[PDB]
Amino acid sequence: AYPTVSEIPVGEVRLYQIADGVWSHIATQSFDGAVYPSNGLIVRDGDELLLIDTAWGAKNTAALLAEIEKQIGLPVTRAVSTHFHDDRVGGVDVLRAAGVATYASPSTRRLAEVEGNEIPTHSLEGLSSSGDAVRFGPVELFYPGAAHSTDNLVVYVPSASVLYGGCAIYELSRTSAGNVADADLAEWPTSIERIQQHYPEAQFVIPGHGLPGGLDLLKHTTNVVKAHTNA
Ligand SMILES: C=C(C[C@H]1O[B-](O)(O)c2cccc(F)c21)C(=O)O
Numbered sequence: 001a002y003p004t005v006s007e008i009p010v011g012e013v014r015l016y017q018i019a020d021g022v023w024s025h026i027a028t029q030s031f032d033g034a035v036y037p038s039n040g041l042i043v044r045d046g047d048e049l050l051l052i053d054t055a056w057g058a059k060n061t062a063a064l065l066a067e068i069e070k071q072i073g074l075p076v077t078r079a080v081s082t083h084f085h086d087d088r089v090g091g092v093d094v095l096r097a098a099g100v101a102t103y104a105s106p107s108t109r110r111l112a113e114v115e116g117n118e119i120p121t122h123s124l125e126g127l128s129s130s131g132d133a134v135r136f137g138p139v140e141l142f143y144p145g146a147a148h149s150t151d152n153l154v155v156y157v158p159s160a161s162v163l164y165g166g167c168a169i170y171e172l173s174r175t176s177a178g179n180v181a182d183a184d185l186a187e188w189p190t191s192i193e194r195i196q197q198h199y200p201e202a203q204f205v206i207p208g209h210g211l212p213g214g215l216d217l218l219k220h221t222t223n224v225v226k227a228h229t230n231a
């Protein structure tokens with residue numbers, strides 16, 4: 001049932017409904033020779049939608065907003081980018097131009113500016129230290145510590161017990177480290193432990209790229225990360 005990378009042409013966006021008012025969005029993009037799927041989240045808050053991460057690029061994010069109008073019919077009023085790389089902020093400008101208020105932590109906004117990437121407008125307060133969590137409309141934002149990047153956020157949707165890991169959580173099919181130039185490999189297993197200790201009742205865990213699972217994706221990610229570190 002969950003759409004897979006070979007099912008989504010670059011430029012099209014799938015929505016997958018996880019629970020009442022909780023969707024993931026799935027798109028695909030070419031990077032360094034290969035085509036990757038990429039996940040974010042849509043969470044209904046009454047008559048508005050919160051968006052978690054772009055669809056990775058201006059074209060995909062415009063297709064995202066178009067799919068939301070067709071399939072859901074509620075406006076996206078706020079977006080959160082979970083770290084500073086292009087599959088999370090790429091398309092912020094399309095969101096801004098459509099009227100979406102775009103958010104990220106101060107660190108993410110600074111890392112995005114330094115790297116040349118699109119920059120969310122608004123700063124998220126309360127997320128500076130590992131273990132910090134804040135409610136943001138219908139979701140909980142959690143800063144687990146440095147992992148895939150130093151700034152990466154994870155997101156929990158209480159109504160549905162959905163944990164979105166972003167690029168800090170790998171899918172089961174991913175058995176090698178996914179480009180770790182900006183990662184903190186010594187801290188990543190500890191940051192994952194913080195996630196486990198905070199959301200032990202998670203039912204549905206979504207990696208940044210690929211198929212959702214359970215909390216077994218956290219242990220898998222630690223294994224992949226430690227395996228890369230020892231050799
Ligand atoms: C192998 C994946 C690539 C994917 O993730 B990224 O580092 O946010 C990032 C940035 C730019 C391109 C891109 F394909 C990606 C990974 O886990 O890092």
Ligand SMILES: [Zn+2]
Binds near residue numbers: 085
């Ligand atoms: Zn990244």
Ligand SMILES: [Zn+2]
Binds near residue numbers: 087208
């Ligand atoms: Zn990524």
